[PDB]
Design a protein around this ligand. Structure first.
Ligand SMILES: *[C@@H]1O[C@H](CO)[C@@H](O[C@@H]2O[C@H](CO)[C@@H](O[C@@H]3O[C@H](CO)[C@@H](O)[C@H](O)[C@@H]3O)[C@H](O)[C@H]2NC(C)=O)[C@H](O)[C@H]1NC(C)=O
Ligand SMILES: Nc1ncnc2c1ncn2[C@@H]1O[C@H](COP(=O)(O)OP(=O)(O)CP(=O)(O)O)[C@@H](O)[C@H]1O
Ligand SMILES: [Mg+2]
Lengths: 1138, 362
């Protein structure tokens, strides 16, 4: 009470189940199509607006209100029961008898390898005085072991028997939502002695919630205070949701339905002003005049009575009808077994249910690779040391398969022949595996067997033996790879790293003899050729994908006794960063060896191997101790989560001596056959955004046949990469050189930077033209004004755009450029924590779940197992859910105005006084039960072709890229088709009564107006439901039943409600109307004239202007798809032939 | 193991008859529909050509007729007999005022004397046509009480219920007593008493009867039930007080269950033409000749320039004589046989043939 402590649940979903209902009801009426029903319910209670059954007006609303409530209940339950079983699923024991769960003031024990749902203030651990390590992965890109040095004073607790003698928690202020800060301090009073102590509590003494602890045991401390003091409750969790184009081109179509409703009341509202100033009418003697007063303002009330009358025109079952269909199409994306990864236990997981139609109208896929397109199990080395290349490969040297012969299996046996000549002789003093598919590159590296008894060090010659051994030790020291206790066969311990690149460097250095056994508390231990040398790594700087510096500053010992031991700097990065950081002038041989190795890097990227190179400066400690002070003060600074450590991690990498480079391989995800002729022959223009280099991405686009042969590879290829700080004001080169061939490549595609004649154009461009813009040639292309348009129009007329998009702001800026400046759907399929900027800045958000579920899966819009499933997700489960939902939405504005205008055409004959024609149950069950089911099962169970033929002919996706289904030209011509049939469904029942008002076979008379609205409704229900029958493909047993049931429900509610006495004027209409043959003669011929225009026009379209999807269906019935099996998946690795 | 269920509904592999509108299914379909609706359109014009009706208006027997047999405007009468033998002959009418009921707006007795050359069949319907009577407005058709229809002795505030039909215009008389049939519908009842016979004047004088029982549906006598009031607290409606001149006795309260021509009037017609049954004769075939109806004029049709008439017919299976459902099935036959003919001569004489597969992307 006074200490203001309420208890709360952990996750912050705003729909708390105690306050679920009043927040939902206010949210239901932020829609301005059901708060319109609150106007015509409170005007249905005032007993002058001619309304019978005033309490049956809250039936067709509150049914839709509660169905949206149980829809939002399921859309809250799936957001808490499937993705959110981490609230409270573990309860710790916390026994205190000797005096995942939440309690303020708890003293929680944290073992190794567990996530902490608390803001724990550390006390001690198994290490030295509270030396805590952590893997803070779900906060930043921090894959380090960030030291959390706890309180060095009170390290006397070991168990929960002495810390349990104090029941106490502290008081803190409001939250701040900053990561590296913690302004809390605790004070405490020791027992039996007046020692006051403020134990200093800073960010080193605490650790946050969403991180994973590593390498320590029994981490102990105090949980946070209530409210919002957790620093992830505000930094991430408030995400704006998204809707489609069709869910944004719907709010125009609703207002066009309200323009028509405001006219039909305005025509009525003046035609009963004109009627109430006639003189020779019947309303003077029989009906009593001066209804409201002595004015003609009883035509302004007759305006409002048409508002209440035209309540089956306002779409109430629209925003529930899309959200039944968007949910069920997404729960069919979920429940498909051909989108299920058997090797991973992972089906497709639709994170956002309401965007199932975005996958039918996408044009740009920003599929960056090495997580997505490939398998990322990095294997080979192909070592390039001291300007000579040691390595032989024919696993992927096949990127240049355009010029070679048919089959070459003898060299794949010669790889095995050199493999057995390399594992045996190098097994001199090594105890690792060294077997088939245990070592990785067959290459006889200098035949190392020279010393037996005479010498141990050498130091006379053969520098290539030393330069290879110095390479491998510097390779197996520049890593962030962790050893692990192998549970089965514990005599061979394995390696575990967060980077699939970085683990491969040590794991083959293991195979050559330089493996590291483990890691001590300060330095590193490595078994180099029998002996186990201890290279003390005193400092390391991390890796980011925006910097490309994996750099350790490991300290070496001085080889002679009695010196100051020097240190190395192995800045292992890309093949253009350390060449931008390399010593040009030198007294060494660091000039004539560069053209040897950089030629091999071109050789070992043109065959499809990922390159990563190794340099090393030989720095001393007269210059390192000031940089370490410049780094540790920057490490003690507030910018430890910023880019101001990058300028300190820039000054020491200025000059380097190049050692060599590696050429680690990467086989594919076998998402080859979808990218060739499924996902790029559809019409979608792929955009690979690697971050890897140019020669390796060109020669992998041929391998997956993204870009095949005869692609004019118009590479941009800027020549200089330098930073500007002064000068160059009268002239320009480094910006003007790429600018002059953004115009010069407009000889292939003749255009200009001025106007957008292509925003209004869609095509899959003839002329191949795969743009290979790369890195700094893109940074100088999206700089400012009037420079984007002179390649964005080039990037429209392409079929592929390519690599070197590093530092993911560029991947953010490209997906934002092609989405904003060309209003079109993007897709952006990726994986990894550096591609969330590409996914959260796009339209669709497909993510790849690898071995673990990463941040590009839990911040996504779908999630599939591989890249192999995107061809089924887009071309089948998105192409259907476009042509379903773009067919449903024109059908729903059609069905509301075949009915609500048929009591406008009666308005002429009562002179618009607002008498009902439909008993007020046919106006009340029309949006709900009569003909609102077959419109739903048109949006859920319609397929234009089969699931196999949507992948045999993928160019049926072109009806969705062109926006050639859903447009306003389709929307108005269904309302003009409804307004036609409103004349048919009224004036065919009218022109049997207008002659002599007798329609029964026994002359007894059905002249009443409720007995006219069964002639009208039964034509308005059956010619509505048969219309939806003629506008679905593949009539099945299910939707073909709910058309036969939704037509036989208007014949059944007329039988069981016109048999009760509660139907006052409508007493026995089932016997009177249906016994009369004038019903069944006006029903069989006014259902004809409602269908006959559209059925002939959809037979005149399908004969002489046929769509592409009609021509495929004509091939379906004949022997053109006889060889294809059902459930056919053509992107599958093990499949038969056609 | 979250594998999704594979039971052909989450896998979407249902029955799927899969209709494709080839020109060898649409062109027999229009040959199938248009060969039905030119036989149905023939049989409806075969049946409805043989319907005989008599429509005679009488809103001006009070002024435009004399006590002798008077002028016959052809604006009024419409005989439709399918044997065009006595179709141009005029039905004459006189007027017998007698100057006793002193109403002077609609009184007297118009005695129409028409002539039927052909014979109707055994059922004979004597309707009444009320053109330009505004019977379908908002305040009008929502003015009665359902409980008083169902035989209930309701109170003053229970004929003023919010639920739809109440009696808000006709609630009480001058001394605070409720009406027995309240609301403007029962207040505005057609008065004109047709006699129970068509007298066979001129030729033989053997009269042709017309029963007023069996007029409404017989199944409608389950919500029209006899009153339960105490003959004192009810008044007649203020336009019925000249057929109940003193009020209600203990014995003049109308049983609304068997009073079938009131049961028709509480069923308001939808449009500005009203045609209700008031006299039937199921038993006797009407022979040829010259008959006479003696209409007791009481209902005013001159303050709104409307009409008032008589519809004598033998209603067929479709009900009445209307050439609409014969024309429409022939328009259904003429359009379907034309859309078959347009989509066949654009097919064989130019247009396309379904012979290729390179039409989509070539
Ligand atoms: C059915 O027949 C009655 C008479 O048999 C027709 O006349 C209507 O009779 C009532 C009562 O006599 C008239 O009410 C009177 O109105 C004047 C003012 O117009 C008033 O001064 C009197 O004190 C009395 O209240 C009524 O005017 C008269 N006419 C009409 C058109 O209602 C009656 O018309 C016939 N039809 C119906 C539908 O009742
Ligand atoms: N742990 C590591 N050690 C050394 N070099 C690395 C490395 N991780 C990445 N690199 C190099 O950095 C360059 C670009 O970094 P990037 O983060 O793009 O790696 P990548 O392209 O393989 C993953 P992505 O394709 O999603 O960007 C690559 O050429 C790679 O060789
Ligand atoms: Mg990646």
């Amino acid at each position: 009470p006074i200490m203001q402590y309420p208890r709360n649940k952990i996750r912050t979903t705003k729909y708390t189940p105690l306050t679920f209902l009043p927040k939902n009801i206010l949210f239901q009426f932020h829609n301005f199509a059901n708060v319109y029903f609150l106007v015509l319910i409170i005007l249905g209670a005032f007993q002058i607006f001619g309304v019978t059954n005033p309490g049956l007006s809250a039936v067709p609303l509150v049914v839709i209100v509660i169905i949206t409530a149980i829809k939002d209940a399921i859309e809250d339950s799936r957001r808490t029961v499937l993705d959110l079983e981490v609230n409270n699923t573990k309860t710790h024991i916390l026994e205190g008898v000797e005096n995942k769960g939440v309690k303020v003031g708890d003293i929680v024990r944290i073992h190794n390898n567990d996530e902490i749902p608390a803001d724990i203030i550390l006390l001690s651990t198994s290490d030295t005085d509270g030396a805590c390590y952590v893997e803070t992965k779900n906060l930043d890109g921090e894959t380090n072991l960030k030291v959390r040095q706890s309180l060095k004073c009170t390290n006397t607790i070991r168990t929960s028997k002495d810390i349990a003698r104090t029941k106490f928690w502290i008081e803190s202020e409001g939250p701040h939502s900053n990561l590296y800060t913690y302004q809390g301090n605790m004070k405490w009073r020791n027992l039996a002695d007046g020692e006051i102590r403020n134990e200093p509590i800073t960010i080193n003494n605490v650790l946050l919630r969403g991180c994973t602890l590593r390498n320590t045991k029994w981490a102990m401390g105090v949980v946070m205070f209530t409210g919002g003091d957790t620093k992830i409750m505000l930094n991430s969790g408030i995400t704006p949701t998204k809707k489609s184009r069709i869910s944004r081109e719907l709010n125009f179509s609703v207002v066009i339905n309200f323009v028509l409703l405001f006219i039909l009341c305005f025509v009525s509202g003046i035609a009963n002003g004109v009627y109430y100033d006639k003189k020779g009418r019947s309303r003077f003697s029989y009906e009593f005049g001066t209804i409201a007063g002595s004015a003609a303002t009883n035509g302004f009330v007759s305006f409002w009575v048409a508002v209440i009358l035209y309540q089956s025109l306002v779409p109430i079952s629209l925003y529930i009808s899309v959200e039944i269909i968007k949910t069920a199409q997404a729960a069919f994306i979920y429940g498909d077994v051909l989108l299920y990864n058997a090797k991973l236990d992972y089906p497709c997981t639709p994170k956002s249910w309401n965007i199932s139609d975005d996958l039918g109208q996408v044009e740009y896929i920003f599929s960056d690779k090495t997580g997505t397109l490939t398998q990322n199990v990095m294997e080979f080395k192909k070592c390039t040391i001291n300007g000579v290349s040691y390595g032989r490969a024919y696993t992927e040297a096949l990127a240049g398969l355009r010029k070679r012969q048919g089959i070459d299996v003898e060299t794949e046996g010669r790889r095995e022949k050199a493999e057995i000549a390399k594992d045996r002789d190098t097994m001199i003093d090594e105890l690792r595996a060294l077997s088939g598919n245990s070592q990785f590159y067959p290459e006889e590296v200098t035949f190392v067997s020279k010393e037996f008894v005479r010498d141990l060090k050498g130091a006379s010659g053969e520098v290539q033996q030393r330069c290879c051994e110095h390479f491998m030790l510097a390779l197996a020291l520049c890593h962030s790879v962790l050893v692990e206790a192998n549970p089965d066969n514990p005599k061979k311990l394995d390696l575990k790293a967060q980077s699939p690149d970085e683990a491969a460097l040590v794991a083959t250095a293991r195979d050559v003899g330089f493996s590291f056994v483990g890691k001590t508390k300060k330095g590193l231990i490595i078994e180099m050729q029998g002996i186990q040398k201890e290279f003390e790594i005193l400092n390391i700087l991390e890796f980011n994908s925006s910097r490309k510096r994996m750099s350790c500053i490991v300290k070496i010992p001085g080889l002679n006794p009695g010196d100051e031991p020097r240190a190395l700097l192995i800045c292992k990065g890309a093949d253009s960063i350390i060449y931008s950081r390399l010593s040009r002038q030198s007294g060494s041989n660091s000039e004539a060896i560069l053209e040897k190795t950089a030629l091999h890097l071109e050789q070992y990227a043109t065959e499809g191997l990922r390159t990563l190179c190794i340099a090393q400066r030989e720095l001393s400690w007269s210059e390192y101790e000031k940089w370490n002070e410049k780094y540790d003060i920057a490490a003690a600074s507030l910018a430890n989560r910023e880019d101001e450590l990058e300028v300190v991690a820039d000054s020491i990498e200025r000059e380097l001596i190049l050692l060599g480079g590696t050429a680690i391989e990467d086989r594919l995800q076998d998402g080859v056959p979808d990218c060739i002729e499924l996902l790029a022959e559809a019409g979608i223009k792929l955009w690979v955004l690697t971050g890897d280099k140019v020669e390796t991405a060109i020669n992998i686009g041929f391998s997956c046949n993204l870009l095949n042969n005869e692609m004019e590879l118009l590479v941009i290829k800027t020549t200089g990469d330098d930073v500007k700080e002064f000068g160059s004001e009268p002239s320009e080169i480094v910006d003007a050189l790429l600018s002059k061939y953004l115009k010069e490549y407009f000889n292939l595609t003749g255009s200009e930077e001025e106007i957008f004649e292509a925003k209004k154009d869609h095509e899959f461009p003839k002329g191949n033209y795969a743009i290979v813009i790369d890195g700094d040639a893109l940074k100088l292309a999206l700089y400012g004004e009037d420079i984007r348009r002179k390649f964005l129009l080039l990037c429209k007329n392409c079929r592929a755009v390519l690599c070197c998009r590093v530092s993911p702001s560029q991947k953010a800026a490209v997906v934002k450029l092609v989405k904003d400046s060309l209003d079109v759907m993007t897709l952006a399929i990726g994986d990894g924590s550096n591609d969330v900027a590409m996914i959260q800045s796009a339209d669709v958000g497909i993510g790849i779940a690898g071995e673990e579920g990463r941040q590009a899966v839990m911040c996504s819009d779908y999630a599939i197992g591989q890249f192999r499933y995107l061809a089924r997700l887009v071309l089948v489960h998105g192409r259907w859910s476009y042509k379903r939902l773009a067919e449903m939405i024109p059908e729903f504005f059609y069905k509301n105005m075949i009915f609500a205008l048929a009591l406008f055409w009666y308005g002429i004959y009562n002179d618009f006084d607002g008498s009902y024609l439909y008993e007020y149950t046919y106006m009340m069950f029309y949006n709900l039960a009569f003909t609102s089911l077959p419109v739903i099962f048109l949006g859920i169970l319609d397929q234009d072709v089969n699931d196999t033929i949507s992948l045999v002919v993928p160019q049926l996706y072109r009806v969705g890229i062109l926006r050639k289904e859903w447009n306003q030209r389709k929307f108005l011509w269904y309302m003009l088709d409804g307004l036609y049939q409103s004349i048919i469904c009224f004036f065919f029942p009218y022109l049997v009564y207008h002659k002599n008002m007798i329609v029964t076979s026994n002359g007894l008379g059905l002249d009443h107006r409720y007995f006219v609205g069964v002639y009208v409704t039964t034509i308005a229900v059956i010619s509505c439901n048969t219309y939806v029958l003629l506008h679905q493909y593949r009539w099945d047993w299910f939707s073909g039943l709910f058309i036969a049931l939704s037509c036989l429900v208007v014949f059944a509610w007329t039988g069981i409600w016109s048999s009760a006495i509660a139907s006052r004027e409508f007493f026995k209409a089932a016997a009177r109307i249906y016994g009369a043959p004038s019903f069944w003669a006006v029903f069989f011929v006014a259902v004809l004239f409602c269908l006959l225009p559209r059925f002939t026009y959809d037979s005149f379209q399908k004969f002489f202007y046929p769509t592409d999807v009609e021509i495929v269906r004509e091939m379906w019935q004949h022997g053109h798809f006889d060889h294809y099996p059902p459930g056919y998946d053509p992107t599958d690795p093990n499949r038969p032939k056609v | 193991n979250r594998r999704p269920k594979e039971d052909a509904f989450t896998q979407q592999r249902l029955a799927a008859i899969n209709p494709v509108l080839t020109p060898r299914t649409v062109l027999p379909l229009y040959l199938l529909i248009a060969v039905v609706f030119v036989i149905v359109g023939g049989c409806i014009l075969a049946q409805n050509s043989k319907v005989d009706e008599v429509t005679i208006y009488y809103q001006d027997c009070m002024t435009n007729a004399t006590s002798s047999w008077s002028d016959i405007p052809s604006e009024h009468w419409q005989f439709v007999f399918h044997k065009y033998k006595t179709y141009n002959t005029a039905p004459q009418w006189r007027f017998v005022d007698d100057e006793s009921d002193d109403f002077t707006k609609q009184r007297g007795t118009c005695q129409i004397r028409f002539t039927t050359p052909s014979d109707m069949k055994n059922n004979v319907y004597l309707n009444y046509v009320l053109e330009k009577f505004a019977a379908n407005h908002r305040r009008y058709v929502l003015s009665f009480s359902e409980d008083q229809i169902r035989g209930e002795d309701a109170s003053y505030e229970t004929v003023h219920d919010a639920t739809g039909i109440n009696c808000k215009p006709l609630s009480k008389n001058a001394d605070g007593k409720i009406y027995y049939p309240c609301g403007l519908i029962a207040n505005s009842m057609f008065n004109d008493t047709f006699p129970l016979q068509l007298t066979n004047v001129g030729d033989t004088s053997n009269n042709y009867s017309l029963t007023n029982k069996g007029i409404n549906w017989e199944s409608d006598k389950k919500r029209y039930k006899k009153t339960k009031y105490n003959y004192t607290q009810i008044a007649p409606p203020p336009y019925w007080e000249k057929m109940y001149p003193d009020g209600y006795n203990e014995t003049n309260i109308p049983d609304i269950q068997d009073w079938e021509e009131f049961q028709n009037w509480m069923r308001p017609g939808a449009f500005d033409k009203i045609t209700k049954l008031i006299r039937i004769n199921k038993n006797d075939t009407l022979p040829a000749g010259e008959y006479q109806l003696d209409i007791g004029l009481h209902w005013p049709v001159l303050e709104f320039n409307g009409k008032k008439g008589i519809y004598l017919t033998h209603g067929s299976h479709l009900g009445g004589r209307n050439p609409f459902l014969g024309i429409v099935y022939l328009i259904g036959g003429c359009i379907c046989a034309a859309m078959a003919l347009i989509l066949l001569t654009f097919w064989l004489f130019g247009g396309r043939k379904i012979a290729d597969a390179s039409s989509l992307s070539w």
